[PDB]
């Protein structure tokens, strides 16, 4: 690790070097500064009407809430363990503040204590067969907290409903709020109460003295894609000025690479965010703030070879850099 003469000996594994050329290593050009850039957004996402709401919706008659064009403070509800059930499988929960997503899909409702575990992508249950189940491409996780002291009433909280029976199987992201009766037997009941035809809508018997399996839980599922489109909403990041003529690591709303940033001199479209070549690599980057288009050209190229004579004669050596203009070196 001192001179290129002895550095060849750690590759050839010998103390006597024959004359010729030997390939040892390659170049590694260090970047200096990090470039991050995000569009100007100052709104706050409506989190007060989701978690801090008095009443919720039902799992049978749910309504998906859309939230966009804001910034999300994910350091107060994901850091504090003020919730009963919180596990996360597909997203790392510690770094939601710098990765950016387009839109979040939230469903505010309540279920019992035996029903918060049977909601999973690909796993069946009493919710996953008749009420709600998740597809395979779900990227996100759930927030659940026990609410037996406030949601449960003495005579029974009859503001909420849930389904028991369904004639068919669910397909993902669908709502069925029909009041069609179930036919279990061979007799046609045709919507009339009778034998082998039961009413699927059932209210909640919310009482504070019940078991832990029937305790109410204020739950909300959150669905969002991760780097599938130009993003709108992410956490409180900071901006950095644009530096040119130096290859650095840039972060333009998730598009991470390493290379120089020169001006573009080709035709472009107002609905084009990046350009690619035949080798499927990023060639141009759109600026989220200014109306400028940059070019991508990487650095840290070339190989290193050592030209040496025999060690029996002398020890003066030289070094040849393969295929790199040494004006930068």
């Amino acid at each position: 690790a001192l001179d290129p003469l002895s550095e060849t000996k750690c590759t050839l594994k010998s103390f006597t070097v024959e004359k010729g050329i030997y390939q040892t290593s390659n170049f590694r050009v260090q970047p200096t500064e990090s470039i991050v850039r995000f569009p100007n957004i100052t709104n706050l996402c409506p989190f007060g009407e989701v978690f801090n709401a008095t009443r919720f919706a039902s799992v049978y008659a749910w309504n998906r809430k859309r939230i966009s064009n804001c910034v999300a403070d994910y350091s107060v509800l994901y850091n504090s363990a003020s919730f009963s059930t919180f596990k996360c499988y597909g997203v790392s929960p510690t770094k939601l503040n710098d990765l950016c997503f387009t839109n979040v899909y939230a469903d505010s409702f309540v279920i019992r204590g035996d029903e918060v575990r049977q909601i999973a992508p690909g796993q069946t249950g009493k919710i996953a067969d008749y009420n709600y189940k998740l597809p395979d491409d779900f990227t996100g996780c759930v927030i659940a907290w026990n609410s037996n002291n406030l949601d449960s009433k003495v005579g029974g909280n009859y503001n909420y409903r849930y389904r028991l029976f369904r004639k068919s199987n669910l397909k993902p992201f669908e709502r069925d709020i029909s009041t069609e009766i179930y036919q279990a037997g061979s007799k046609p009941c045709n919507g009339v109460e009778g034998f082998n035809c039961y009413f699927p809508l059932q209210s909640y018997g919310f009482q504070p003295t019940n078991g832990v399996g029937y305790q109410p839980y204020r739950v909300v599922v959150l669905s969002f894609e991760l780097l599938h489109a130009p993003a709108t909403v992410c956490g409180p990041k900071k901006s950095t000025n644009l530096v040119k003529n130096k290859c650095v690591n840039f972060n333009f709303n998730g598009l991470t690479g390493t290379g120089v940033l020169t001006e573009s001199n080709k035709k472009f479209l107002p609905f084009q965010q990046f350009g690619r070549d035949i080798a499927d690599t990023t060639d141009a980057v759109r600026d989220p703030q200014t109306l400028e288009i940059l070019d991508i050209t990487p650095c840290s190229f070339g190989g290193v070879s050592v030209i040496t004579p025999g060690t029996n004669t002398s020890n003066q050596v030289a070094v040849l850099y393969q295929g790199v203009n040494c004006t930068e070196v």
Binding site: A279, T281, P298, F301, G302, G303, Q322, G323
Partner: peptide, 22 residues
């Protein structure tokens, strides 16, 4: 007679001017 992810092309030892002299 008639790409930067580690690929490189080494130049030959005998150039086009020295082949035509042979």
């Amino acid at each position: 007679v008639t790409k930067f992810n580690g690929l490189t092309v080494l130049p030959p030892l005998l150039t086009d001017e020295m082949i035509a002299q042979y």
